[PDB]
Design a protein around this ligand. Sequence first.
Ligand SMILES: O=C(Cc1cccs1)N1CCC(c2nc(-c3cccs3)no2)CC1
Ligand SMILES: O=C(Cc1cccs1)N1CCC(c2nc(-c3cccs3)no2)CC1
Lengths: 194, 194
Amino acid sequence: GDDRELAILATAENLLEDRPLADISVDDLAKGAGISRPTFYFYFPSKEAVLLTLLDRVVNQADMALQTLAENPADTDRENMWRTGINVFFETFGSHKAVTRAGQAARATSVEVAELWSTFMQKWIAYTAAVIDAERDRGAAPRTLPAHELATALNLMNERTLFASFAGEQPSVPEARVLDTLVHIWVTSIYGEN
Amino acid sequence: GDDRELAILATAENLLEDRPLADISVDDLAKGAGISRPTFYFYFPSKEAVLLTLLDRVVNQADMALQTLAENPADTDRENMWRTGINVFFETFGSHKAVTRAGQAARATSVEVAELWSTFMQKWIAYTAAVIDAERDRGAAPRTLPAHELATALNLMNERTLFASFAGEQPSVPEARVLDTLVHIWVTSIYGEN
Ligand SMILES: O=C(Cc1cccs1)N1CCC(c2nc(-c3cccs3)no2)CC1
Ligand SMILES: O=C(Cc1cccs1)N1CCC(c2nc(-c3cccs3)no2)CC1
């Protein structure tokens, strides 16, 4: 049941490291999970549905980590505050590169994946805008751009930049430099008067 | 010849406003261009090849505009300098939304489109890094992040942010706000000490 479902998910994540979803068959997933093809269909309608579930788990893992971080007052300087927050995503997605990559590609062909991604981006944007708003209320950040618009561009930068780095795209920021790069751009853009 | 090729390209751009490339047939393109299906194949191997040519034209149009801007000394303040440069892309791609959108989607399925996009991004990144380098050499910008890494993240932000805006994605910065948004983030990140 749950163990059979978990074995399917684990197999899918494992095979995605090696090849794209299109190059993975239901037969591959069932065999890896130690089940027959018909029993696979009991747990999932398609290999696409398996990817959706994997992505859902990873996105919720990131979201929960951000919540935990948020629940702390975490006595710190402003640059470190944003660094720890960006790090949640760098580490969570960076620890699930195959799922991240496959998940992003599926946005084009799956309305469900597209909606899932959109939902969490909206959530993460709203949270960053709320923190920017709090910083401004405190007198720590200047009232420059609309906070929500600023948050949107910064989050979209992170999406494109982190994922290009993890995939080793040309061009991309080296994975070992991407955290410092994004932190600099967040801190200067949020706190910079100009 | 050239007029028949131009009519094919014009028809493709026109139909792409209404539907995705997959929903456009060779028959559709030939009919719009006032030619037969077999004569279409004289000019292009596929509808995919037509999209590549459209994208190539748009990307070169943007690149040439940037070059012209660069050839000016254009006596200005630093914020306006970057604004005029980002505007080249906002206007060029914003004037060819259908081609931009279709072109970006084709990155996933066409190595030729993927390479074309990569080539020009690399070029635009190198140019921005060179300008940042010049600014630092002049004493106008502080020596913070590696210039090329900074340029990479900023250009990737522009790619994701402009294209989400043009497509009206959820989430996206409103098209009427995206230029000011990106300019703020460029100027604060390039000139900000912190
Ligand atoms: O990187 C992202 C989100 C991403 C989107 C796509 C890839 S990564 N974020 C969103 C949330 C943002 C944030 N941190 C915080 C913090 C609160 C307390 C410490 S950090 N609030 O918002 C950090 C960076
Ligand atoms: O927006 C972009 C490139 C894009 C990439 C993807 C979408 S838009 N750029 C790249 C070049 C950058 C630049 N401007 C300049 C200028 C020289 C002189 C005036 S502006 N140098 O580099 C402006 C912004």
